[PDB]
Structure 1
Amino acid sequence: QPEPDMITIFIGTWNMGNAPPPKKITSWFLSKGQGKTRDDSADYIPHDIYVIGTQEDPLSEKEWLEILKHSLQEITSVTFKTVAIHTLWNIRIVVLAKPEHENRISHICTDNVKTGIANTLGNKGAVGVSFMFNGTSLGFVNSHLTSGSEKKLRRNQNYMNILRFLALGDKKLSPFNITHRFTHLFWFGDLNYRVDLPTWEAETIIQKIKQQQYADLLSHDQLLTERREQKVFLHFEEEEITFAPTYRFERLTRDKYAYTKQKATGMKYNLPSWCDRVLWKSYPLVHVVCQSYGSTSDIMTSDHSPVFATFEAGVTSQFVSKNGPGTVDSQGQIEFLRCYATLKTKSQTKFYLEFHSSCLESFVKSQEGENEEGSEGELVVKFGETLPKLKPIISDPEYLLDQHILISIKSSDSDESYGEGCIALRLEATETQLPIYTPLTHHGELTGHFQGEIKLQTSQ
């Protein structure tokens, strides 16, 4: 049986509004309703992995697992295995996978982050799962962020706290947060960003939704506008939204949006909004294609509609040679030429680089670079030709071209990272000097750039 080079992943996010689900939720897992839907001809074909995020979930883990497994069985006639389940308060993540994948999946991690202090620590935060699928790392985050049209800043703070403090993936990647630890990172949930228009425009917004004219509404979506201004989800992708706002509906129909202020809302308006979202971040030049992104029309127990997204995701095999793992393959090397970091920091310390990759036996510290002043005020850290020669464990190009090098630039004084980035080894040529580039981030904020040239030698 050949190892896969592609899998499909189902991502679901549903704020259940503290109500039991109805008896049939199969439309969700079939990506049927509004938006980018899945072709009918695929209905009997199981996804490899199903990741279900819920918020305001009133069910026990046992109750929800039984509904999910029975749903997938009815659709596909496959009995899915449970990879992971993690619940913080009423926020839950379930990872199910085809039985054939049991022995491909390892290094299963779960964590949660609680957002807010005293007042605002009580019910919002995130849960997550990570694991290895053969040679590919996969991360999944389900977040319920702060509610309310006037709290978009709070939501961006909740996001930053979750990405800094969620402990998933390989703990040896100590300078790297979850936005660098995975080949593919899926981040979904009730992100609670709103359509930011005047309250007086509510009936006009509803009119626009009934005409399926979302363009004027999406131009005021806080997640898109905050993303555009690099305030949140920097370097993440989202598929185009072509489904109606998934919030806030009257229960037991989808014909009415309940937007008017009520005691039960703290006297806040809930203008129709795309609260419920799926975003992703994959390492450079890895295959990732969104094949569906939409909302169900027929599940009406909650004031939110379920959202589905499906993805084709590139995976690699667990490579073994005569040499690595357990030694270097002296036929392979990675060289860096004319490298310099540009940092936004106003500090003056010396900096050095760390290279981390599963293609290395362990991480590699460089010598200190030479600080110069950029023409526009920037700190430029010059490495020239001084960066070490990296010795991959395997030189076979079918392995090595599929790998990535994570880079941290660290202060000599404190050993704290000032920036993290990622370089693909999927080069246009081997044994050829080729430009490389990564933005650098720290706590998910842009802190600079790394650029130069690479020269990769494989056994070919």
Structure 2
Amino acid sequence: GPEPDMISVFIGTWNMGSVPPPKNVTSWFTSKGLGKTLDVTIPHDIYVFGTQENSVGDREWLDLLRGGLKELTDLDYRPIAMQSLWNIKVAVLVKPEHENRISHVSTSSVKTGNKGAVGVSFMFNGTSFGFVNCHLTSGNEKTARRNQNYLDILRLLSLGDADDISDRFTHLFWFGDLNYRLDMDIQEILNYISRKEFEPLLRVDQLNLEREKHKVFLRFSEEEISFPPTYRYERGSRDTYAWHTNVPSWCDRILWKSYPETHIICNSYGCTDDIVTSDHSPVFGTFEVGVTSQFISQAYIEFESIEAIVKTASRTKFFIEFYSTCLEEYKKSFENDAQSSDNINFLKVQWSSRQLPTLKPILADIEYLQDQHLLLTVKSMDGYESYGECVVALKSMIGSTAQQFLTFLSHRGEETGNIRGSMKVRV
């Protein structure tokens, strides 16, 4: 009980339109405006600010953010880190008291016009966080290029540390001017916007469509959108869309991907309507997020069997590597001892208990172990390349009797099958 079990995280994304911001951006910080909004006078534990087309210097911009929070909260928020890629910038600020809870800070950037992404990662006690702020390709017809920018960022971002960042963090937030547009005629768009009927517009949102096709943001969630398209506004008010062609669109988005059986709840998601220097409106999202401090405040993990369904026609043997922060070093299986055809595109590979390792956690405490996760990777014996990664929560696995886990494999932005197994955690 002495340490935090839960924190409140603010994420903001704002394309500043290459002009100075207004002195007062308080509405952004406080989730005031349109959509799912707040009233709450209680400052967040962490503020993450992502910006695009930001012409304010790195230091000056950080000073504006600290000064604004100081004015709002009377606390001096501490920069954990900041990363810029020319006019694409991200800053993470934290309440003074959490300074000593932060460790393993990392930053990275990927350039894909200035387009690309900047990232920050760290641990908060035993829980890891990643934040990716991006500006993807512009224009209604450039969906394929946006998708490719996403894949390049995913592949090249060197945050944390696996093959890519998608499974590296307990909670991964990806936000920015993703630049996906509405696939609809201007007249219909404007009619739905005036009547405040966003559901028919969301049906033709290109990001939603590409996510459903499994091209981008595998495993990510986004909160329901109840606020109007944030692009493209005439400057100086929010009365008019400048569409002369740039149809109104939800360019500016916040998404997340979390490890299984963790606590995360979106408390707000919306845009401001009183910040008018840019052709985009700022977007805010706030989250209540579980944090594990059990390590701060003999055990064995055993496997009776594992069965993977893997996208491949290879006749090579396979093994599994097991990684976790609760282990001194990773472990690996022997080769699979049975194999068969699942489908025309998939093989079934099976490891009996004989082929599988016994993992030995760093601490034997039951509450500690309940908050841990294992990263499993299926690799070929010929060349050692990965065919799929997944994450398994220990939460429901504590006992003398083996229980089943079931989850899904991915690799390099593709779904590559599934994995089912029988395990137990003994203390």
Shorter-chain TM band: over 0.9
Which one of the candidate residues 37, 51, 56 is aligned to 2:53? 56
Higher mean displacement: 103-112 or 443-452: 443-452
> Equivalent residue of 1:75, what SS?
helix
| Equivalent residue letter for 1:233 | F
Tell me what 1:156 maps to: 147
CA distance in 2, matches of 1:32, 1:110: 30
CA distance in 2, matches of 1:358, 1:177: 17
| Cα deviation, residue 391, structure 1 | 1.0
CA distance in 2, matches of 1:318, 1:130: 21
| Equivalent residue letter for 1:183 | T
Correspondences of 1:202-281 after superposition (within 5 Å)? 202-260=186-244, 269-281=245-257
Correspondences of 1:177-192 after superposition (within 5 Å)? 177-192=164-179
Higher mean displacement: 159-168 or 13-22: 159-168
| Equivalent residue letter for 2:145 | R
Which one of the candidate residues 98, 101, 106 is aligned to 1:101? 98
Tell me what 2:340 maps to: 373
Correspondences of 1:317-328 after superposition (within 5 Å)? 317=293, 319=295
For the pair 1:138 / 2:129, whether they are aligned, the reply is yes
CA distance in 2, matches of 1:345, 1:46: 50
After superposition, give the CA deviation of every residue in 1:233-276 in whole Å (9 maximum; x if it has no partner): 0100100000000001111110111112xxxxxxxx11110000
CA distance in 1, matches of 2:18, 2:70: 25
Contact 2:309 2:342 in 1 (8 A): no
> Equivalent residue of 2:51, what SS?
strand
CA distance in 1, matches of 2:342, 2:61: 59
Contact 1:371 1:379 in 2 (8 A): no
| Equivalent residue letter for 1:436 | F
Correspondences of 1:32-51 after superposition (within 5 Å)? 32-38=32-38, 40=39, 42-43=40-41, 45-51=42-48
Cα 1:24–1:457, aligned 2, differ >3 Å: closer, same or farther? same
Cα 1:417–1:428, aligned 2, differ >3 Å: closer, same or farther? closer
CA distance in 2, matches of 1:363, 1:277: 36
Contact 1:441 1:447 in 2 (8 A): yes
CA distance in 2, matches of 1:338, 1:96: 45
Correspondences of 1:353-372 after superposition (within 5 Å)? 353-370=320-337, 372=339
For the pair 1:421 / 2:397, whether they are aligned, the reply is no
For the pair 1:111 / 2:91, whether they are aligned, the reply is no
| Cα deviation, residue 381, structure 1 | 1.3
CA distance in 2, matches of 1:412, 1:273: 48
Correspondences of 1:309-348 after superposition (within 5 Å)? 309-317=285-293, 319=295, 330=298, 332-348=299-315
| Cα deviation, residue 138, structure 1 | 0.6
Cα 1:147–1:370, aligned 2, differ >3 Å: closer, same or farther? farther
Which one of the candidate residues 295, 313, 320 is aligned to 2:271? 295
After superposition, give the CA deviation of every residue in 1:131-158 in whole Å (9 maximum; x if it has no partner): 0111111100001011111111111111
CA distance in 1, matches of 2:270, 2:296: 40
Contact 1:126 1:162 in 2 (8 A): yes
Contact 2:215 2:413 in 1 (8 A): no
Which one of the candidate residues 347, 355, 364 is aligned to 1:395? 364
> Equivalent residue of 2:417, what SS?
strand
| Equivalent residue letter for 1:443 | R
Q: Which runs of 4+ in 1 moved over 6 A?
A: none
| Equivalent residue letter for 1:315 | V
CA distance in 2, matches of 1:367, 1:18: 56
Tell me what 1:327 maps to: none
| Cα deviation, residue 182, structure 1 | 0.5
Tell me what 2:379 maps to: 410
Correspondences of 1:82-93 after superposition (within 5 Å)? 82-93=79-90
| Cα deviation, residue 176, structure 1 | 3.7
CA distance in 2, matches of 1:409, 1:137: 23
Tell me what 1:65 maps to: 62
Tell me what 1:282 maps to: 258
Tell me what 1:266 maps to: none
Tell me what 1:384 maps to: 352
**What stretches of structure 1 of length at least 5 have no aligned partner?**
116-121, 261-268, 322-329
| Equivalent residue letter for 2:168 | R
Tell me what 1:265 maps to: none
> Equivalent residue of 1:203, what SS?
helix
CA distance in 2, matches of 1:129, 1:250: 32
For the pair 1:9 / 2:12, whether they are aligned, the reply is no
CA distance in 1, matches of 2:300, 2:69: 46
Identity of aligned residues (%): 58
Cα 1:353–1:428, aligned 2, differ >3 Å: closer, same or farther? closer
For the pair 1:129 / 2:105, whether they are aligned, the reply is no
> Equivalent residue of 1:179, what SS?
helix
| Equivalent residue letter for 1:147 | S
After superposition, give the CA deviation of every residue in 1:3-29 in whole Å (9 maximum; x if it has no partner): 100001000000000011111000001
Contact 1:350 1:371 in 2 (8 A): no
Contact 1:360 1:393 in 2 (8 A): yes
Q: CA RMSD in A?
A: 1.3
Contact 1:206 1:257 in 2 (8 A): no
After superposition, give the CA deviation of every residue in 1:215-237 in whole Å (9 maximum; x if it has no partner): 11000001111111211101001
Count of aligned residue pairs for this structure pair: 425
